[PDB]
Enzyme design. Structure first.
Site, PDB file in Angstrom:
ATOM      1  N   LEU A 240       0.865  -1.174   0.000  1.00  0.00           N
ATOM      2  CA  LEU A 240       0.000   0.000   0.000  1.00  0.00           C
ATOM      3  C   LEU A 240       0.905   1.228   0.000  1.00  0.00           C
ATOM      4  O   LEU A 240       1.233   1.763   1.059  1.00  0.00           O
ATOM      5  CB  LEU A 240      -0.967  -0.013   1.199  1.00  0.00           C
ATOM      6  CG  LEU A 240      -2.234  -0.851   1.039  1.00  0.00           C
ATOM      7  CD1 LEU A 240      -2.838  -1.177   2.391  1.00  0.00           C
ATOM      8  CD2 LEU A 240      -3.265  -0.150   0.137  1.00  0.00           C
ATOM      9  N   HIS A 241       1.339   1.638  -1.207  1.00  0.00           N
ATOM     10  CA  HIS A 241       2.252   2.754  -1.451  1.00  0.00           C
ATOM     11  C   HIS A 241       1.798   4.089  -0.839  1.00  0.00           C
ATOM     12  O   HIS A 241       2.492   4.621   0.032  1.00  0.00           O
ATOM     13  CB  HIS A 241       2.560   2.887  -2.953  1.00  0.00           C
ATOM     14  CG  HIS A 241       3.021   1.610  -3.585  1.00  0.00           C
ATOM     15  ND1 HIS A 241       4.346   1.216  -3.528  1.00  0.00           N
ATOM     16  CD2 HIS A 241       2.308   0.660  -4.232  1.00  0.00           C
ATOM     17  CE1 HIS A 241       4.402   0.053  -4.155  1.00  0.00           C
ATOM     18  NE2 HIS A 241       3.203  -0.321  -4.603  1.00  0.00           N
TER      19      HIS A 241
END
Ligand SMILES: [Ca+2]
Ligand SMILES: [Ca+2]
Lengths: 317, 312
Positions: A240-241
């Site tokens: 989850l950048h």
């Protein structure tokens, strides 16, 4: 104690998680959502941003539409294979009843920053086109921004657009080079650190059994993102950048930063590559990294603390 | 059991250590020394190579002079600040009595490889100009070379020519891209692994008290290299030699390597890790992968270099 922020975003599955986290963050005020291409078209990103404001009961949060193409021009290559045809997975939601504001993302950025000097932090979750256009329009923008938290680049790590480049930088290299060279207080969160923060089936399913305000939707949207990750890598883990980038803005203690001049390759096969001058070595000749002011690059990340932080915000009722 | 090798080199302080190590290696035959620019000019590299052959009593080893400039042309930027004005530190040695062979490095390379097919291993210790010219001259060269051990590149590590590029690749990017894309059996030893293998004052002084054949000279030449530099030195070329003769001390990763020839990041080596299937064809898709040194057993490599240098 309230922290004024503007989110420049291309929602985007991981962008949606970060936007909802910002709306759930206690001492955070989202001044507005600035839209851009990348994960989806600018049109889709604007629609998705309006949908998020409606779902979160944040109808007071204005949405300003930005550039439809990069600085150099031409129709951008959108990541619909990773984010879905509309950029929100298979999540079939009806058209939002709310509309975008009349002002462009550039004009919204310039206005809010000049109104609250040294107070507005900009969270760049997609290509840096709007931020670069804002820098070019107002010379005092660089001076007036509190800080720019950038999600992008790959520093001594593999890229995701090409082996050399990360998507956000690859989508507009000219803009990224203009921002990194602007002399503003910039914090870069690259793939080198975001690929360390893994989310297994355990945490994703832990999120489902919780009484989180937007838990059911976030698990539904992450389902498409999980299927792509398992197909492309062969692993049941997801990165989850955007939420990690948000954690760097509100909780920088969970990270370690390194000072250095960052340049972006705009030409050739390695277009979009981010090269950082480590400053530990004095160069025998003047090169494209000498003279420019250094920016902070995320170097180390406390992986268990960041995962627990994201989980505490998402599971929040 | 004898292993036939050709050394493409720019001596060079660290190159000289590796050449002398090759001459001291038991089951190794040095077919010849191929000269190139880089640490010094091609002229100086040729002179230094001839001096090394004389000192090692290897006058039978021919020296073939290569290209004076990269594929694109223009006077190359030599590293005289790190290697000395002549490329051999402050070691003032008289002119060698022996001469270079009439054939070019390209012609020597093509000839020896075609004579012994699948037997000749090429150790590239400097810019890849001669190897690329050899590939372009003979189409069967790629097929006939046993393996090419390349000292160059920076894979997920800082460069030494620029933050993005390693010297050997930066000196001729076009040649490096042509070699990495050739489809030959290539082994790349980058800064990512060479900067792990450190040599303190302790090992350098341990070398002085020993009865090593060329110990006194190698300590004298490394003295200038130490002053340029932390009191540690990285012997790049000897590590590359250890990858050729002792690959067990290293771990390799398969992948397509491309070189940036344009812009600010000229000389950068980008490796496709192959862990992700790309949705579309890119400049890393239509090419055969090469082996990149990933892990190095640092204490074993240091002990290996020491055992060869201290050898009487
Ligand atoms: Ca994004
Ligand atoms: Ca060399």
């Amino acid at each position: 104690p309230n922290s004024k922020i503007i989110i420049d975003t291309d929602p985007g599955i991981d962008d949606s998680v970060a936007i909802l986290m910002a709306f759930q963050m206690p001492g955070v005020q989202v001044l507005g959502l600035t839209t851009i291409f990348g994960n989806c078209t600018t049109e889709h990103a604007t629609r998705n941003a309006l949908i998020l404001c409606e779902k979160a009961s944040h109808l007071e949060v204005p949405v300003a539409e930005g550039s439809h193409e990069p600085l150099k021009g031409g129709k951008p290559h959108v990541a619909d294979f990773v984010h879905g045809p509309d950029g929100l997975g298979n999540v079939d939601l009806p058209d939002p009843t709310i509309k975008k504001v009349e002002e462009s993302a550039t004009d919204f950025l310039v206005d809010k920053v000049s109104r609250f000097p040294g107070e507005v932090s900009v969270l760049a979750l997609g290509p840096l086109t709007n931020i670069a256009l804002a820098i070019k329009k107002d010379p005092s923008f660089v001076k007036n921004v509190k800080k720019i938290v950038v999600l992008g680049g790959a520093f001594f790590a593999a890229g995701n657009a090409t082996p050399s480049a990360e998507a956000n930088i690859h989508s507009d290299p000219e803009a990224a080079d203009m921002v990194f060279t602007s002399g503003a207080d910039i914090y870069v969160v690259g793939l080198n650190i975001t690929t360390q923060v893994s989310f297994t089936d355990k945490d994703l399913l832990e999120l489902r059994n919780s009484q989180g305000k937007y838990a059911q939707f976030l698990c539904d949207v992450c389902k498409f993102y999980l299927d792509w990750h398992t197909e492309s890598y062969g692993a049941p883990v997801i990165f989850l950048h955007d939420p990690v980038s948000f954690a760097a803005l509100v909780r920088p203690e969970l990270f370690t930063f390194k000072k250095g001049v960052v340049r972006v390759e705009t030409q050739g096969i390695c277009v979009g590559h981010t090269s950082m001058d480590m400053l530990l070595k004095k160069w025998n000749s003047e090169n494209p990294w000498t003279g420019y002011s250094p920016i902070s690059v995320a170097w180390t990340v406390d992986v268990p603390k960041v995962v627990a932080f994201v989980k505490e915000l998402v599971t929040k009722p």
